[PDB]
Swiss-Prot record, chain A:
Sites bearing N6-acetyllysine, chain numbering: 23
Protein name, UniProt field: Coatomer subunit beta'
GN (gene name): Copb2
Organism: Mus musculus
Role played: The coatomer is a cytosolic protein complex that binds to dilysine motifs and reversibly associates with Golgi non-clathrin-coated vesicles, which further mediate biosynthetic protein transport from the ER, via the Golgi up to the trans Golgi network. Coatomer complex is required for budding from Golgi membranes, and is essential for the retrograde Golgi-to-ER transport of dilysine-tagged proteins.
Domain of life according to the entry: Eukaryota
Compartments, record wording: Cytoplasm, Cytosol; Golgi apparatus membrane; Cytoplasmic vesicle, COPI-coated vesicle membrane
From Swiss-Prot, chain B:
Location in the cell: Cytoplasm; Golgi apparatus membrane; Cytoplasmic vesicle, COPI-coated vesicle membrane
Top-level taxon of the source organism: Eukaryota
SUBUNIT field: Oligomeric complex that consists of at least the alpha, beta, beta', gamma, delta, epsilon and zeta subunits. Interacts with SCYL1. Interacts with JAGN1. Interacts with TMEM41B. Interacts with SVEP1. Probably interacts with PEX11A.
Function: The coatomer is a cytosolic protein complex that binds to dilysine motifs and reversibly associates with Golgi non-clathrin-coated vesicles, which further mediate biosynthetic protein transport from the ER, via the Golgi up to the trans Golgi network. Coatomer complex is required for budding from Golgi membranes, and is essential for the retrograde Golgi-to-ER transport of dilysine-tagged proteins. Xenin stimulates exocrine pancreatic secretion. It inhibits pentagastrin-stimulated secretion of acid, to induce exocrine pancreatic secretion and to affect small and large intestinal motility. In the gut, xenin interacts with the neurotensin receptor.
Gene that encodes the chain: Copa
Protein name as annotated: Coatomer subunit alpha
């Protein structure tokens, strides 16, 4: 009966009543009438026509929508898309949590790009590492003035930037003269670098490694490939 | 200043001494001073500075009370050895967490965090994503089913980034770092 009336209601009317309908709990039906982007939106949150919600979003026109929505999407476990929205949002933090949990390089490159974006030094490093990229970690340091720290990495996992880098750090120190403050040596004397001969470089292990990076470590797994990184690793690594 | 030999002719209270400890940079006096400092910030700058000047063997301690725990952890993972971080991991995991477990996992393969993690999540989702490769996707499914599952779509993420790097023989780690005033 009402439907005959329905033509003979418009804009705003629909809204009020929609709220009534919503009160009725005739959410779907409430959806059908739906009439305000906001109105549609909130209801949409309740409702979850997911795709449908997207169309309403269309171009959302507010990350806040995406943020709100992201939580919702994620709940529905409509991730493929969620990723698209979140990505669309480029809302890195939550998105990272998923991306990381299954794992992914690709995410990492784009993200790397992002990593560059973020404005505090630290996250970006994990990324660089995570990717496996000393190089990236070290380059990053150059901008931030992480210098003592950069040396440790450069030493540990040797890109022998310890030599290069140390000179520069030392130079800062140098600026701030005093001989102790200057501090000096790479192959020999103070440090014996390559003459010490101990644990962050060489070819053979490295060759084995070269491959290693390429295969999946294995134990028993899924399509989501292996790498391990534990006891065993220590042993071969020494070899 | 001209030498801390100067410091020696005269100087006083730990507070004063401290001032000297910066002014000279008298970090000898600092050491004690530090002990006696406890004006945090004071420290707080200082261990680094101490490092900056030298010795992380010591610096680690300094930082230890300082609650730059993560930082120390970072030092440990930087270096190419495995335990210390793990106890620490225990001892901060044990002190709650929702975004931090991550620290333990990467340099590792295996994590135990997952046992805990599932509890925070408990949607079998995380548990699967994480799970599958030890050849263990399966338990994550068992619960997931039990629930009345809710997964239905996923995004890219197939393990594809390298958790690799650290320190095979020749050209170190750095537990301890040598130097020289020269």
């Amino acid at each position: 009966m009402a439907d005959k009336v329905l033509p003979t209601i418009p804009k705003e009317q629909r809204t009020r009543v929609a709220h009534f309908l919503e009160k009725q709990g005739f959410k779907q039906q409430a959806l059908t009438v739906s009439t305000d982007p906001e109105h549609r939106f909130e209801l949409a949150l309740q409702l979850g026509e997911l795709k449908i919600a997207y169309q309403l979003a269309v171009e959302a026109e507010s990350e806040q929508k995406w943020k709100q929505l992201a939580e919702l999407a994620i709940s529905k476990c409509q991730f493929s898309l969620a990723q698209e929205c979140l990505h669309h949002a480029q809302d890195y933090g939550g998105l990272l949590l998923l991306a990381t949990a299954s794992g992914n390089a690709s995410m990492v490159n784009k993200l790397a790009e992002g990593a560059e974006r973020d404005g505090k030094n630290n996250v970006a490093f994990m990324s660089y590492f995570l990717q496996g990229k000393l190089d990236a970690c070290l380059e990053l340091l150059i901008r931030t003035g992480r210098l003592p720290e950069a040396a440790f990495l450069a030493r540990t996992y040797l890109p022998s930037q310890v030599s290069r880098v140390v000179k520069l750090w030392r130079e800062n120190l140098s600026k701030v003269n005093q001989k102790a403050a200057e501090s000096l040596a790479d192959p020999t004397e103070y440090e014996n670098l390559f003459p010490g001969l101990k644990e962050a470089f060489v070819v053979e292990e490295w060759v084995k490694e070269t491959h290693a990076d390429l295969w999946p470590a294995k134990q028993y797994p899924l399509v989501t490939p292996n790498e391990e990184r534990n006891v065993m690793e220590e042993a071969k690594g020494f070899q | 200043k001209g030498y801390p030999e100067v410091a020696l002719h005269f100087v006083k209270d730990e507070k004063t001494r401290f001032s000297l400890a910066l002014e000279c940079g008298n970090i000898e006096i600092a050491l004690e001073a530090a002990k006696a400092l406890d004006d945090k910030n004071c420290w707080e700058k200082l261990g680094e500075v101490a490092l900056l000047q030298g010795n992380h063997q010591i610096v680690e301690m300094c930082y230890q009370r300082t609650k730059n725990f993560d930082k120390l952890s970072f030092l440990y993972l930087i270096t190419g050895n495995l335990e210390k971080l793990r106890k620490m991991m225990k001892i901060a995991e044990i002190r709650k967490d929702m975004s931090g477990h991550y620290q333990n996992a990467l340099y590792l393969g295996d994590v135990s965090e997952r046992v805990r993690i599932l509890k925070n999540c408990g949607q079998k989702s995380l548990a699967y994503l994480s799970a599958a490769t030890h050849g263990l996707d399966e338990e994550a499914e068992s619960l997931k089913e039990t629930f009345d599952p809710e997964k239905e779509t996923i995004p890219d993420i197939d393990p594809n980034a390298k958790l690799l790097q650290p320190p095979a023989p020749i050209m170190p780690l750095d537990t301890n770092w040598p130097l020289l005033t020269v």
